[PDB]
Amino acid sequence: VRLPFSGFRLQKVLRESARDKIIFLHGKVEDAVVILEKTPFQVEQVAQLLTGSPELQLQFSNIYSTYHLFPPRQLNDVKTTVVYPATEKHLQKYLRQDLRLIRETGDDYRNITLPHLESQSLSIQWVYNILDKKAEADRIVFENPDPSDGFVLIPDLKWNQQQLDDLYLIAICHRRGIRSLRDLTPEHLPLLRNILHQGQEAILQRYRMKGDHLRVYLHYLPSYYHLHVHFTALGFEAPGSGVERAHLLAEVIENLECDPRHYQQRTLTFALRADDPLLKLLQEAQQ
Amino acid sequence: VRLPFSGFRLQKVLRESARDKIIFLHGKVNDAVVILEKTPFQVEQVAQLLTGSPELQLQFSNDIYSTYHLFPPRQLNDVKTTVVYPATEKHLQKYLRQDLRLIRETGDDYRNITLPHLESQSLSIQWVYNILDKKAEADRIVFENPDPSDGFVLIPDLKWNQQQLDDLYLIAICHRRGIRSLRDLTPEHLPLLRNILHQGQEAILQRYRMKGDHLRVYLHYLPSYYHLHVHFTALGFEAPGSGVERAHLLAEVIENLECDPRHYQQRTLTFALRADDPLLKLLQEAQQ
Ligand SMILES: *S(=O)(=O)c1ccc(COc2cccc3nc(N)nc(N)c23)cc1
């Protein structure tokens, strides 16, 4: 299959991680962002390769010997995400900037964060497309169609589905208007309970993965402002599973049962890119 | 050019890292360990490939977004192959990771199951005492508040080589004895916690010229040793332990104790345990 465009002219390498074996490239085609990621190893096809005669070229020796391996097509998979046409929100996002941590009080959110957010963030159209089945229908793992307490559990774009090691699914709620953790009140408890339980039971049916192998969380300062819950394999150090962003659903539910006004009043901690205008707005508000 | 042995029989997958695109395999030969790692991308070769006609297979398409499966030529298909032959059990022990299971411990679970289990296994924290009474690692103290109750000792963690700030990792050990974990914290510990957070950070700013907003300051629930200690790490340093299933931010810990005094005695804490952990079974059995 052909790319959604014709020809690529690299403009800038937005991000280049040697540790995560990923590259984010901005190119002119019109504007387009192409993400290439080396796929994780599949135990079966590797074990099968080592039992035979592989193509190796020695780098160095010792007991420690290093080689350069050239495996056949099957092992040569690369995850290719194409964003076309890509907006200025996309080009700024993927860029590597130093991060600074900020502690947002209930008043900081009301006065600084919420008005900034309302000034606008991103199009959520792809979310709507999933929810109204205009896209990815074939990939829905489970759906509770209830307009208020309902959701859609779909594997995330970031998971190639070839192995359970990096299992990553999202529960996207059917109800519109819940931007983040900050909009949550006790009226959202039946929705959240539905996600926690029905989302895990769906993973158990589909992937035979017990709930104690799952890390179920929300992100504070999410990438998109339509409530979504992450379901990640525990052995997977999922970028974003870190304490400065992740909030366990079970704990979110429990806090809400304890303190109804919790997420509206309490101070939330998150990181922001040094170049983020919101970071300055909060910094200035705090001094 | 070839292999140091003849034939491979995979017995056990020692370690996996789907984020690092690496695999650790123990296999029987002629005992050996083969490490396979996907090689990083080369901007040039990739840019050159996208300007032409690549072999792509669509996974799906949604709005402006679309995912594919790419099969590049030989030049992009390199895999780093480290071979350890012959292999011994201590290497098999340093290279094998245990399967983890998550558990949600209620206040009552801790009181009835966790605490009695902890008390059963007589664990020595003599090395901690040695630091505190300066019998060991005196030369490493970055900062010390000597107050017997509200005081602490700030020491760089031994894994941090101190040659760069990128992986800055310090630990504060409190002078006061008897605070095993997060579960022992009450509002009486607020002056100590406030000193650890504010003094610890001020010391890091003076010593390392690292502003507080570049620091992730946390506690571990189910710590490796049961004498209260807080971690001070560089924010850009993403290395497990900073994950939500274990880390608890000191600032948040303080705020919780200001709101709910009885918080850490009553509330349900979530953490992971190694599948072979006797405590994991004890909690599982208690819960059903
Ligand atoms: S990026 O290219 O890394 C990138 C951009 C946007 C998003 C938001 O997520 C999706 C966009 C479109 C479809 C989609 N479908 C599923 N199943 N899951 C997600 N997460 C997305 C992600 C990555």
From Swiss-Prot, chain A:
Induction context: Up-regulated by menadione. Up-regulated by the transcription factor LTF isoform delta-lactoferrin (at protein level).
Motif (nuclear export sequence (NES)): 93-105
Motif placement: Histidine triad motif: 226-230
Residue list for modification Phosphoserine: S53
Residues that coordinate or bind substrate: 126, 136, 156, 158, 219-230
An individual GO BP term: deadenylation-dependent decapping of nuclear-transcribed mRNA
Result for mutant: E37A: Reduces decapping activity
InterPro entries associated with the record: DcpS/DCS2, Histidine_triad_CS, HIT-like_sf, Scavenger_mRNA_decap_enz_N
Principal subcellular localisation of the protein: cytoplasm
Tissue: Detected in liver, brain, kidney, testis and prostate.
Modified residues (N6-acetyllysine): K89, K93
Keywords in alphabetical order: Acetylation, Cytoplasm, Disease variant, Hydrolase, Intellectual disability, mRNA processing, mRNA splicing, Nucleus, Phosphoprotein
UniProt EC number: 3.6.1.59
Record-level Gene Ontology MF annotations: 5'-(N(7)-methyl 5'-triphosphoguanosine)-[mRNA] diphosphatase activity; identical protein binding; RNA 7-methylguanosine cap binding; RNA exonuclease activity
One of the Pfam families matching this protein, by short name: DcpS
Localisation: Cytoplasm; Nucleus
UniProt similarity note: Belongs to the HIT family.
Function as written in the Swiss-Prot or TrEMBL entry: Decapping scavenger enzyme that catalyzes the cleavage of a residual cap structure following the degradation of mRNAs by the 3'->5' exosome-mediated mRNA decay pathway. Hydrolyzes cap analog structures like 7-methylguanosine nucleoside triphosphate (m7GpppG) with up to 10 nucleotide substrates (small capped oligoribonucleotides) and specifically releases 5'-phosphorylated RNA fragments and 7-methylguanosine monophosphate (m7GMP). Cleaves cap analog structures like tri-methyl guanosine nucleoside triphosphate (m3(2,2,7)GpppG) with very poor efficiency.
Written domain comment of the UniProt record: The C-terminal histidine triad (HIT) motif and the N-terminal domain are required for the decapping activity. The N-terminus is necessary but not sufficient for binding cap structures.
Known disease link: Al-Raqad syndrome: A syndrome characterized by delayed psychomotor development, moderate to severe intellectual disability, poor or absent speech, microcephaly, congenital hypotonia, and severe growth delay.
The protein's name: m7GpppX diphosphatase
Gene designation: DCPS
